[PDB]
């Protein structure tokens, strides 16, 4: 699919180029990354009897057997998140962006803090009923916006943000997840793969903004992959939404909440065979449709 001669005022072509390069280097940076491989090797060996491990170490295929499964998972995840639209989707995205509510004056930090806090509470009964919890998240949000404003985003800011969004937690908790975790039939990246690609997503957020790539589309993609990678032990959902909404609000767009209950499980791979799967570009389109409704 060549996009060279398509109508484009969103710099979708610059975005796709960015994605092509990351995808081309994905095997090198992730699949062949030795820390990731060691992680896979250790995970796999845990269930294998030691005497069987001793036997297998004599066989040339052992390392690949150890790393095959983990690698296929990351490839499936990367396949799902890599933005590569059809010509139709390309054109539809050009259309949708024009229908998006967009203020010409950008609201101040305190107003953003409130809109992002309200967006978080909108999908959570627990935050709606617990003012102390809501106020804590408000503080973390204000703190994040404060430190990220007019600066390159860093992994450190996100770590601080994630921790701030985990207030009822107790002391001494792990920040990042220590093992492959799941819930609601979800497939997430491994801990190490998630760390590698969190750093990549950060750089993507900084690069896309510099190239003036359409923020609503940047927001959509960031939402999907941060949730797919899910690097942290807890609060990956809140964290992704705060970051995406900084991206949207910076451009004058309204805040995003969630997809429908029927579409959400399609945005990342699932352990359940029956659940439908949505491409990255299909996720972007739906994201834009949801975002366009926010005025009403």
């Amino acid at each position: 699919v060549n996009y060279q001669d398509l109508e484009d005022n969103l710099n979708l072509k610059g975005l796709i180029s960015l994605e092509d390069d990351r995808n081309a280097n994905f095997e090198s940076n992730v699949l062949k990354n030795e820390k990731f491989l060691d992680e896979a090797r250790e995970i796999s060996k845990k269930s294998i009897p030691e005497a069987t491990v001793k036997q297998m170490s004599h066989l040339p295929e052992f390392d690949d057997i150890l790393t095959e499964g983990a690698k296929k998972v990351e490839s499936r995840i990367n396949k799902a998140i890599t933005f590569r639209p059809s010509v139709e989707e390309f054109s539809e995205i050009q259309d949708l962006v024009k229908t998006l509510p967009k203020t010409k004056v950008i609201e101040d930090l305190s107003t953003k803090t409130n809109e992002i806090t309200e967006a978080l509470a909108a999908t959570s009964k627990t935050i709606q009923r617990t003012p102390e919890l809501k106020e804590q998240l408000k503080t973390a949000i204000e703190d994040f916006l404060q430190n990220s404003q007019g600066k390159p985003l860093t992994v450190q800011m996100i770590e601080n943000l994630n921790h701030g969004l985990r207030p009822d937690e107790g002391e001494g908790r792990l920040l990042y997840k220590k093992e492959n975790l799941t819930k609601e039939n979800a497939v997430f990246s491994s801990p190490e793969a998630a760390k590698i690609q969190l750093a990549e997503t950060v750089d993507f957020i900084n690069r896309a903004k510099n190239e003036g790539i359409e923020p609503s589309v940047v927001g959509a993609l960031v939402y999907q992959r941060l949730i797919a990678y899910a690097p942290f032990a807890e609060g990956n959902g809140r964290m992704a939404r705060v970051i995406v909404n900084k991206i949207l609000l910076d451009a004058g767009y309204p805040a995003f909440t969630k997809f429908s209950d029927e579409f959400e499980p399609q945005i990342i791979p699932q352990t359940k065979a029956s659940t439908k799967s949505a491409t990255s570009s299909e996720v972007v389109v739906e994201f834009l449709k949801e975002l366009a409704k926010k005025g009403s």
């Binding site: 269930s47 057997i65 499964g69 998972v73 799941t182 819930k183 352990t271 029956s274």
Partner: protein
């Protein structure tokens, strides 16, 4: 130690039933894709049995790796969700041929999971709209004898109904 290995499709509840059994609490938050192997003391007739519990990754990606954990298995738990017809079909198409090829002469139980969902309005509405239905114990029992399983048992990790009995039967299956 009696080694018990849990197999079956993704999302049938393999991990949640192991955790619910060992902790007496159904996990509500994040859960490991694969529960770390854990030993437990089980009392049968006033005698303690040490039961080694092994979880697995059910998805096809881990097909090459999975059998490596099978050596010296004493009993298999082949799990399907009673509200997932596809997971039930894979019992016959994949799981029992897998364990008979990769771990012959090893007894296995047929385990129906998530039986609480047979009373869930949303689950049953969906099945009926797709012209499907939950697996009844009777067609599961037939499958069990067809495939030469020791027996069919079923449980719910959420309510823990039948959950204790599953691992009681697994030990018997390994002792017989």
């Amino acid at each position: 130690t009696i080694k018990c290995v849990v197999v079956g499709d993704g999302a049938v509840g393999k991990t949640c039933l192991l955790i619910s059994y060992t902790t007496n609490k159904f996990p509500s938050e994040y859960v490991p894709t694969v529960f770390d192997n854990y030993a437990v003391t089980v009392m049968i007739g006033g005698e303690p049995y040490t039961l080694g519990l092994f979880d697995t990754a059910g998805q096809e990606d881990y097909d090459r790796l999975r059998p490596l954990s099978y050596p010296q298995t004493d009993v298999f738990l082949v799990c399907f969700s009673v509200v997932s017809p596809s997971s039930f079909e894979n019992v016959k198409e994949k799981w029992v041929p897998e364990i008979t090829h990769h771990c012959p002469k090893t007894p296995f139980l047929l385990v129906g999971t998530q039986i609480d969902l047979r009373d869930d309005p949303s689950t049953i509405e969906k099945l009926a709209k797709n012209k499907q239905k939950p697996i009844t114990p009777e067609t599961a029992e037939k499958l069990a004898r067809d495939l030469k399983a020791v027996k069919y048992v079923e449980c719910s990790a959420l309510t823990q109904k039948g959950l204790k009995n599953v691992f009681d039967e697994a030990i018997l299956a390994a002792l017989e």
